[PDB]
Amino acid sequence: CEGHESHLSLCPVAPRPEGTCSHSRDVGVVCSRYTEIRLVNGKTPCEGRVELKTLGAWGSLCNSHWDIEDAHVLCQQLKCGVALSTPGGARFGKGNGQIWRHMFHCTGTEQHMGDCPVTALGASLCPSEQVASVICSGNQSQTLSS
Amino acid sequence: QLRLVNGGGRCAGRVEIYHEGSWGTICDDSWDLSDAHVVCRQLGCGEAINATGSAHFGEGTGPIWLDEMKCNGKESRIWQCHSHGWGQQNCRHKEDAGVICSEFMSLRLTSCAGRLEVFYNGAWGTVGKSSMSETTVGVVCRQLGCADKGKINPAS
Amino acid sequence: SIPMWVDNVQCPKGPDTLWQCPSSPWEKRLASPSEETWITCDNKIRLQEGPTSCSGRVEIWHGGSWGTVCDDSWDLDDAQVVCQQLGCGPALKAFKEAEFGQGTGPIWLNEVKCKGNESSLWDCPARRWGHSECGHKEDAAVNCTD
Ligand SMILES: *[C@@H]1O[C@H](CO)[C@@H](O)[C@H](O)[C@H]1NC(C)=O
Ligand SMILES: *[C@@H]1O[C@H](CO)[C@@H](O)[C@H](O)[C@H]1NC(C)=O
Ligand SMILES: [Ca+2]
Ligand SMILES: [Ca+2]
Ligand SMILES: [Ca+2]
Ligand SMILES: [Ca+2]
Ligand SMILES: [Ca+2]
Ligand SMILES: [Ca+2]
Secondary structure: OOOOOOOOOOOOOOOOOOOOOOHHHOOOOOOOOOOOEEEEOOOOOOEEEEEEEEOOEEEEEEOOOOOHHHHHHHHHHOOOOOEEEOOOOOOOOOOOOOEEOOEEOOOOOOOOOOOOOEEOOOOOOOOOOOEOEEEEOOOOOOOOOO | OEEEEOOOOOOEEEEEEEEOOEEEEEEOOOOOHHHHHHHHHHOOOOOEEEEEOOOOOOOOOOOOOEOOOOOOOOOOOHHHOOOOOOOOOOOOHHHEOEEEEOOOOEEEEEOOOOEEEEEEOOEEEEOOOOOOOHHHHHHHHHHOOOOOOOOOOOOO | OOOEOOOOOOOOOOOOOHHHOOOOOOOOEOOOHHHOOOOOOOOOEEEEOOOOOOEEEEEEEEOOEEEEEEOOOOOHHHHHHHHHHHOOOOOOEOOOOOOOOOOOOOEEEEOOOOOOOOOOOOOOOOEOOOOOOOOHHHEOEEEOOO
16 A cells, blocks of 8 residues: 555555465554544434543543534534534433543544544543533534634 | 566576566566576576576566566476466565576676686686787777777786 | 652553543642552564574564564674664574564564664664565564574
């Protein structure tokens, strides 16, 4: 590959007829989009309390650093256009679990929360009822404008 | 068609093979002396001393055609060997395969003055002084690219 | 002696930086030296697929992934610098064309023009950090002394 291909199908390859490899040498690739943030407990499928999974357990995201740009990026990732608002409090529910203190610093111009610069080290504790939420527009054709 | 280029002679140089209207090279992967024997005897150059790799005679400008030559040294053509197939290669031009054959001949003077030496069959060697006419000395000096005439001198 | 900022750092899988790792909130508190963390990172360069630990194919870590060194301009000086970097004795042989087997990941280094006395392979001049025209069939190897 030249690195600029859209799919591996477009990559030129060099097959070898002889033996290839052993299964003890299979390749594994780690990409940067590992966030795994979803929307739960909403009337329409793609709005509700923001729920994030790290350390093998789901959790609710704090609203202290949940600006409208973070909501916009999350809505773009879930393919529901822009974010109408971020309802504070437990409008969609406090969530059965612990609160994740991740501080996403999205500028609102990226289409995935994994592209956002997230800071979670030593983040300040969050009140239980102060759980972040988002109400996406729901229109895929709707796009963010500056 | 098969040819050797940038070899400084007739029986040496990077192996250029012809296919699909373009002159392409051969990758030096598993390019041992058995592969060199086939191309040297195919070109009427006798046996082979070196099966050079890593673009010894310069990097060619053309599509690498063959990758894994498994010649037994008995077939009369290079393309009759067992290979990966035309175009099937995982090589670059930095590792083009060239050969140095038995009939490759080179001339040098070692001290443009010094003992006349001729490179045949892969080994350097001197040239007899007997019946060394002036024309032969002129030919030798001209072939070294430094004169048109010369004088026979005793050894230092 | 300096205070402790953060404690209970729990890195998930995926972050390549510590600040995406959740932990307890920042607190400026005094810390005894016993309960601070002292970590020794593993060696930058390892030898793989060798009969012993001092011989095998040269693997180097950079850019997040383990890589290899191509055999172009891979003389015995490069083997000497690799052997003295790993802590093994003097070099014996500098193999070429993947004598010990094809490597892993990308090809970080090729044409390493070491003088044989550098402190590490990184100070050695080369076409560094990828974009090398070599394939994985040309992985360089060494043979040090036990
Ligand atoms: C050819 O092979 C001989 C045999 O050892 C070697 O001495 C000589 O250096 C080689 N020459 C080239 C150009 O590879
Ligand atoms: C490495 O060097 C040792 C010491 O002579 C030798 O026994 C061993 O066979 C060498 N390994 C290779 C792969 O040549
Ligand atoms: Ca934010
Ligand atoms: Ca090959
Ligand atoms: Ca090669
Ligand atoms: Ca062969
Ligand atoms: Ca090479
Ligand atoms: Ca070198």
